[PDB]
Structure formats: structure tokens, C-alpha cells
């Protein structure tokens, strides 16, 4: 749940902060976190389930990192970042939907979808960052 | 002998160079931060043509372009690889340019149909190779023939095409976007002059130079002390104050037109009548009274105040002339500028030899360690208004603290600056000349009173001297860039009170003020030292943080701190106490890294894995899987036992195994044939023999781990079976699947893509970087006769 | 709109974060953004118009940059920042009021005031940063 | 009041952002502020609560600084930070409760509890940082 929230917060911050013309100092830490998330998620296969009419969806991560060497962000940077942000947002939304439509009697607080169970492994703990909500 | 031994023991813990004065040279040799210019684009990779093989292992008739490290020198062992990357970080930091002018690197493009240019010569070579290549796309060829640079001289901009690996482009673009040069104009230079020298009417500053819009400069890093070396670093602070004292001595002016030593000596001898007394030291009384001593006193006082170096008072108690001059010394110099013991001794000598005997009071039985000084007690115990008021001033004349332009400054009382308080001193000691000295022998009483009058009758000269000393202190303090932190130093500067007497009795009325060039030189030396201090702090912090984030647990921060202290140029590192070294290490660890160095480190850290996997002489691991696995078919090898990942296998970290020394698990798995993956930078043997694959030699390279309990000699076999093999007919002419029980976890080179490598590098067309801003200022000074103090009156009014 | 919001957000961040005694590490990025805004706006003349009873106001931007060589912010730094922040807040409030009182049938989504039209130029896009509201 | 708010804000940020596995770049400025708070509060004695049934609590601050050397935060860092944060949060809650139960007819806007009066000294002004609420 903490890793899923961290993914969602990173993507929300990327949408809000990665804007054309902005100083890179405004997004330096955000871009570092985004690249950390890319590195952690790369090479992993995820599946959001078919419970109900929700479709079975397969997710693959082979994304390159974002640049960190511009003084001010430009149109190319924003477009390149958006291409990755869209896929990550789709994955996060589908994982959230898959987790929302599931319940358990024995342990209802633990993750139910296999995607969130996979994200609860140690290897993904690196994605975890600010939990302010 | 005993005193010498104890002082040597104390001094061996102070990293101050024993020949004090030599420090000056070491302080004046600190040049501004060297301006670095880039001569060629920073490259880690180059394109290279490599043979490729078909799925059947046959070599193709064309080569393919791939990215390969220009210098493939990565060592084996994960820790060694991380050390290599720390060394690369140091190399990049040292070679990082402060500015770039891409036009200097631009070269002719041979294939250009419109007189095109490219940066740099390596780009030209790559472009020519791609142009002549037969497999190049027609569109790419035409683009190379047509890609153009754009030089806008009116805008002072240049854009050049370049071929760069994404990592190389990242580094070069960071260098281009984050240059340290700022525009330079006459307003910047004017504001560079200290604000209190620009407002001084004794100095006429003019700007007789014209700066073009293409004038640039690099701002010195005048960030205040982040290490707080004034707190809990006694030896380092002693060294710092000693060096500052030497510099201030160098810049303090020399007194002119002093009173004739012969005439003053005769006057003092006649007034004191020492020969008529029964003093056991008749000759020693007037020794040390000369112009050289006066100059030494002037320099010592001003330099100690500027450097905030504690002073010790050296005096002979029987020489009451020294005590009388010490009264003036204590009047003008703040009492917190002397070591407590010396101040107590001098004040108690004055009280018990002059003041209390004068008023018939019982001699003070001062107890050392008393929170009150002898003068603080005498102020309450003496009822006379003149002497009591003078004592009150002397008690309360400590330095005041004020921040000017962000620099902490120790400033004097306004009565010291204008020299008015000397009148009170005169008043006080005039009363001492009228006192009875109830039980004192009349000849000795007369001698004391006549010495008191010797100092009293120089009221005008002493007012002039006080104003001159205060003005020189203020003017030279305007040129200090680091906070004037007041701490009691381990070792003091010994001030002979005979030198104070010489200064008091020989000062004339010739005003001497620091020359404008002397002020500029002092300010430049201070700025250079401050900038170097900050830059070396930044370097030390960057390297420590990089070593910690690179997980270089065997790296010793002691060597980093020693290098940092050495580069400060004023520390003899052999004499730095260990506790202070470790405290410095801790304080450096607590600081945050500088933005430029941190960004470069972020680049290196994020590109580490890609740079490592681009090496041809280390593999990322070896999978020992005791089942037969088909040799993968790859364009770069033919058949190769290459693992694309370590999924499905237990991973043993060879670095952790080496460090722990526990080979129980690895030995158990090797003996019991348990599939595993040894992870770590490993050298490997490239075997092209099919007979070696049949003989299964790749599985015979791990028993040495069990035998020697070492993993440094582990060299897995990487099979490269293709048509170039001397026995490829075995693969081609027989129906079998080449397999092996081990795989080498390694990556494949990245293919050269022209679209991904073609960039436009943008810089300025040209500019000139200047270092000595103050060389642009024409500074003159009024005649010394006309020099005025802060109150708009002349410094010396006796004329 | 993005640039106007970025000005407002920068000024709000300056009011909240530039306080006496605060570590400069707390405001380094904020100070950089503020200085970039000052540089971008410096030398530009703006006018907020006289539609209705709204008074015609002229705005000139000639402000010095905020310092960056302190360990902790002090009273001088706060005062120097606060004067500029007050002027910029007045300008932003007047621009927002000018834009709020305007409408058009054809391009109502587009800026209506002359000031916001000026701020929509490319030379002001550098001011743009985090759009999180 | 601003120093108390800064303490509370620093502790909330520490609780939210000092999480296992997070990049140190995500907490660098926060860790600097937290270390500043620790240095400022160390060696100070506070007393909270002598009105009504509010218990008398004595607070002593002797805490070590948080490390700045990790790449990604691990369990040890989080545990040390959590112990320190727990003590500081208890202190802040008690100070707030003590202040909330007091009132003055003459200077009701000024601090009432002796703890907040102590915090209004200059030596604590260094703790002050972003006041965004």
C-alpha cells in the first residue's frame, strides 16, 4: 500500500511539476525519485486480474531514465516524461481498481490483488517515499 | 630547559608552521580558483564496427556499429568497480570546465554541401565513417551532408551538431548549461570593493576602464564557515589566527616621522632620575625604547585585533614606565584581546604599584580565578571620579559585535575611534601625579609621578595615536571576508610593554593610512583564502558523500580530511590532534553536497550500471546450473552461454562472500551441485573452441573457490562459438544442440543509432573571463596630512 | 494562466518559507525560482486596465536578486525579500482582478487582459513551475 | 508560536518522509532541518502542565543527529529517527495542550505557557522554517 501510494504520488508530482520552462532545481529531487521508481520497476512483469468484467491486463516495464542535465525543462523533456507517465499512471490506476474490487475475511487488511502483493516485496521498497496524505 | 620542553610539548599539537613569517608566502600563493576551459567534448563511449553472426553462427558480410568504452579499464570485483567509479567522479570533478566555447572545438565537416561545421573532431570522424558506410540510410547520409551549424554573432550564440552517446551528451550538456561565468560590468566591480572603503573620503576610487558586454567573471565562494572551526578546534583555530596575524602584520603601514629617539630618551632619563634611585635594574629601565619597537607595537596591536589572536603581556613589574604605558594600552585595546592571566597580571601590577599606593589604599590581595579583574574591584574601591571613571571605561571596553555585509566584525567603542577617551586617561593619571603616596619614599614617589606626567603631557600625541590605530584597524577590517570570531587561542602573541612605551613616547603627528593598493592586496588575499576554504570544503564533502553513497566501506575519510587540510596551505598536518581530525570528519559528513558536484555525482551514479555493463573484460556474474541449457544465439557471438538475467536462481554476492570469509554455504552448494548464481564483477575467459564446450571446461572453474576459499581467481568461461572457431564444423556438420551447465551474466553492446546520438550543442560565440576585478579600479589617496577619520575630522590634529 | 499561477505560487512559497532564522537549505530551490522570476520580470512594463471602476495601474519591475550566501536567513534577508514579495503580490492581485472582470464569446478560454496576454509570451515561460492545485 | 509550528511541521514531515527504503535525496533538506532542530533543542529543559489535572511533565533533550551518508534509508536510520520523533512529538503535543488551556486578559495574543515563552527566545529562532498552514 505504501509502495502503491509512492508510485501514485510520484506520478502526480511528475504531472504537476514536470512542466515546460521550469527550472530543473524545481524537480531535481522529483526526477531522482522518478528515476529510482523506473529502475525499481524495470524488468518486472505485472498482471491486473480479471475479477468481474475488469479485463486481464499485462504490464511490462522497460523504460529509460529521465534527463537531469537541463537548466530549464523544455518541450522535448516534457513530452518524453509524459510518454512514461501515461503508462505508469495507467498501471497504477489498474492496480488500484484490481485491489478495490477484492475482499478477504481472514486478513482483509493485507493486499488482495497479486499485483499489490508483488509490490509488497522487499525489492520494491526503494520506490517508497513521502507518505503525507 | 623545563619551560622549553613544556612549550615544545604544547606546540607539537598545533599545526602551525614553525617559521611563522613563512606563512605569509603560503598565504599569498593561494591563487584564485583556476579557470578550466574544455578543449574537446567529454566522451566515455565511441562507435566501433564489430562483426555480426547469423542465427546459424555464420559471420555476416557486414559489420555493425556499437557503442564501446573508449578506455576499457574496469577492474574485477564489485568493490573495485565502485572504487573505479569514485575515481571517475574525481576525474570528472577535476576536469569539469568552468565555461565552454563550442566554436573553439568546431571543425570542418568534409561531407557538408553547405560549409557545415561540427563539434568536435571526434564527431567529424564518426560522421565521415557513417557517411562512407554502405549500410547507412540514404536519409541519414543526406542529413549528414546537409546538417548545419547556426552562429548568431549579434546574439552571441553558436549551435553546432555533435555525435555523442547519451551519457556523453548528458555530461557535455550539464557542462554547457551550468557554466560558472557571470556577466561582468563596472557596477559589479564597484560593488566588489568593500562598502566601507567606497564610503571613505580618504580614498578616491574611479572606473577608468570600459568593460565589453562579453566580459565575464567567476564569483568567489564567500560562504561563511560551515565547519565552525572557531568552536572546539583549538589547534586549527590557533593556526588560522596565527596566519591571519602574519598577513595583517604584512599589510599594516609603517609609522613615519617618529620623535627623535635620542631627544625622547634624554627627556625620559632626566624626568625619571633613575640613577638617583636604588633600583637594582638601572640600565634596563629605558631599554627597548626605539623606533623599531614602536613600529613592532603598532603592527602587533593592529594585526592581533584584525586576526583576533590573543595577546600576552610581557613586562617587568619594577619598570613602572612600562606599567604607565600599559595604562594607555588597556585604555585603547579591548581587554578581551589579552589572555586572562596577562590582563590580570598587568592590571594588578598597575593597581599595586601606582594606583592603590597613590591613594593610600591597602594593596589589593587579588585571588586568581576571581570573576572580577583587579580593575573591576578597584573601580568600586576607588572614590576619585577621574580614576574611577577611567577604570570603568577600561573594564567595559570590550569589542562589540556587528554584522556588516554579512561578515561578523569586532568593532571598537566610538570613544576609542575618535580618541576622546585618552583625555579621561590623562585626567585619571593627572590625578595620580597630584596624589600624596602616603608611605612611599619621596624620591621613588617623584620618579613615579614624573613618569606619569611623561605619559600625561603627550595627551595630544596619544589622542592622535589612538585615532590613527583605530582608523587603520577599521580600514583593514573592511577588507576581511570571514567572520571575526573571538576565541581565546592556545598560544598568544607576546607584546612587550617596552614596545608600548616606545609607541606612546615616539609617535609624532605624521598620519599613515593603508595604501589603496595595500588594501586591495589584503582584500584579495582574504578573498582567495576564503574561496579556497569553501572550495576545499566542497571537494571534501563531495568525495566523502560519494564514497558513502558508493558504499566504499574501506575508504578512510582520514586521508580525505588530511588532503583537505593540506590544500588549505596553512596547516602542518603532522601536528593535528587525532580528536580534532575525527571531529573535522564528522562535521564534514554533516554538511550537504554542493549543487554542481552533487549533480555530477547523480549522473555518474545513474549511469554506473550502464558504464559497467559496457566493459568487455568483466561480466556481471556466473550462473552455475547443473542442467544442460542451450547456448543462446546472439549476433555478437554466434552461440554463447550468456544469461540475460539471474531470475530463477539463488544469488550469492561474491563481495559479501569475500568480506565475511564464510564459505560454508558456497562450499555446500558446490559440493552438492545446487544451482546458484555468483553475482559480482568477474573476469571471464572467452573460449571459441567447440571441443572445449564438449569437454565441459566451463564447469571446472569453481572448485578453486572451495580449495583456496578465495573468489578473486574465479574466471568463468564464456563460450563464443561461431564460424571463426577452428572446429565450427562440429556444430555445422552434426545434428546436436550446443549446451552448457553454466552461463555468464553479461550484457550486449548498445547499437549505434544516428537519430539518438545527433544533438545540437549550444554555447556563446565568445567572451573574456577576468579574475582580478580590482585591477579595473583606479584607486588614489588624499595627502596623509588631509586624511580624516570617521567623524570627518583629521586623524592627527596636533599637526 | 500557468505563468500567472506560477507567479502566485512562487509568492505564496516566498511568504511561507522565507522566514527569519530558517536554514538556507530550506529555501535554496525557492530562492532560485524567485530569482528566476525576478530576472524574467525585470525590465518589463505591465498595465492593468480601467474596465469599469477598476483603476488603471502601471507596473515596473526593477528588483535586485535575493542573496544566496547565508547559512540561516536573518532579518535583512527577510526584509529585502518581503518588499519585493509585497510589490509582486500587488501586481499579481491586480492582474487577476483585471482578468476576472473580462469575457469573450469567441475565445473565452484565452486570456482577455493585456497583462495576461503579455505573460503568455515565450519569454515568461521560464517562470512556470509546479502546477499542483 | 512560529517556532512551535516549525517543530510540529518538522516532526510531521519526518514521520511522513523518513520511511524505510526512501532515497536520501527525498529527505536531504528535511534531515538538515531535523538536525538543526536537534542541535537547537539539545541541552534545554522544559516543563509542561501545572493547570487543572494536566500532569507536570519534564522534558530533557539529549539526542544524536541523523545520518547524512545513506543512499536509501534502511531500518536502522528509520528506527533512530522514529525514537527521536516519538519523543519530540510527545513534547510538542504536551506543549500545545499546556498553551491551549491558558488565557490572559491583557496579552492574550502572547504566549501563556512557560514552555512557549522559552521557545520565543532568539536561540530557538533557528528552528523556524516553512510556515505554510
mmCIF file of N, CA and C in Angstrom, chain A residues 28 32 35 65-66 68-72, chain B residues 170-171 173-174 177-178 599 602-603 606:
data_model
loop_
_atom_site.group_PDB
_atom_site.id
_atom_site.type_symbol
_atom_site.label_atom_id
_atom_site.label_comp_id
_atom_site.label_asym_id
_atom_site.label_seq_id
_atom_site.Cartn_x
_atom_site.Cartn_y
_atom_site.Cartn_z
ATOM 1 N N UNK A 28 14.483 18.526 -9.236
ATOM 2 C CA UNK A 28 15.671 17.689 -9.102
ATOM 3 C C UNK A 28 15.376 16.446 -8.271
ATOM 4 N N UNK A 32 14.872 12.553 -9.427
ATOM 5 C CA UNK A 32 15.627 11.470 -8.803
ATOM 6 C C UNK A 32 14.699 10.353 -8.340
ATOM 7 N N UNK A 35 13.338 8.451 -11.406
ATOM 8 C CA UNK A 35 14.312 7.521 -11.963
ATOM 9 C C UNK A 35 14.512 6.320 -11.049
ATOM 10 N N UNK A 65 15.562 6.252 -18.339
ATOM 11 C CA UNK A 65 15.522 7.278 -17.313
ATOM 12 C C UNK A 65 15.285 8.652 -17.933
ATOM 13 N N UNK A 66 14.923 9.603 -17.078
ATOM 14 C CA UNK A 66 14.727 10.983 -17.488
ATOM 15 C C UNK A 66 16.026 11.763 -17.349
ATOM 16 N N UNK A 68 18.679 14.730 -16.520
ATOM 17 C CA UNK A 68 18.902 15.502 -15.304
ATOM 18 C C UNK A 68 19.928 16.608 -15.511
ATOM 19 N N UNK A 69 20.072 17.109 -16.739
ATOM 20 C CA UNK A 69 21.184 17.982 -17.092
ATOM 21 C C UNK A 69 20.745 19.293 -17.732
ATOM 22 N N UNK A 70 19.448 19.572 -17.791
ATOM 23 C CA UNK A 70 18.959 20.829 -18.333
ATOM 24 C C UNK A 70 18.818 21.861 -17.225
ATOM 25 N N UNK A 71 19.106 23.115 -17.566
ATOM 26 C CA UNK A 71 18.871 24.202 -16.625
ATOM 27 C C UNK A 71 17.380 24.489 -16.487
ATOM 28 N N UNK A 72 16.655 24.478 -17.602
ATOM 29 C CA UNK A 72 15.211 24.645 -17.631
ATOM 30 C C UNK A 72 14.613 23.547 -18.495
ATOM 31 N N UNK B 170 24.833 13.783 -21.863
ATOM 32 C CA UNK B 170 24.394 14.265 -20.560
ATOM 33 C C UNK B 170 25.495 15.066 -19.884
ATOM 34 N N UNK B 171 26.715 14.529 -19.880
ATOM 35 C CA UNK B 171 27.826 15.232 -19.244
ATOM 36 C C UNK B 171 28.109 16.558 -19.938
ATOM 37 N N UNK B 173 26.181 18.368 -21.873
ATOM 38 C CA UNK B 173 25.071 19.297 -21.723
ATOM 39 C C UNK B 173 25.029 19.879 -20.320
ATOM 40 N N UNK B 174 25.383 19.090 -19.303
ATOM 41 C CA UNK B 174 25.489 19.663 -17.969
ATOM 42 C C UNK B 174 26.590 20.709 -17.918
ATOM 43 N N UNK B 177 25.175 23.848 -19.794
ATOM 44 C CA UNK B 177 24.048 24.537 -19.181
ATOM 45 C C UNK B 177 24.392 25.161 -17.836
ATOM 46 N N UNK B 178 25.463 24.713 -17.188
ATOM 47 C CA UNK B 178 25.789 25.097 -15.818
ATOM 48 C C UNK B 178 27.197 25.663 -15.741
ATOM 49 N N UNK B 599 25.177 17.091 -8.642
ATOM 50 C CA UNK B 599 24.555 16.745 -9.915
ATOM 51 C C UNK B 599 25.460 15.848 -10.747
ATOM 52 N N UNK B 602 25.210 12.486 -9.279
ATOM 53 C CA UNK B 602 23.951 11.851 -9.648
ATOM 54 C C UNK B 602 24.038 11.264 -11.045
ATOM 55 N N UNK B 603 24.644 12.004 -11.972
ATOM 56 C CA UNK B 603 24.823 11.495 -13.328
ATOM 57 C C UNK B 603 25.659 10.220 -13.324
ATOM 58 N N UNK B 606 23.690 7.253 -11.692
ATOM 59 C CA UNK B 606 22.623 6.692 -12.509
ATOM 60 C C UNK B 606 23.157 5.998 -13.752
#
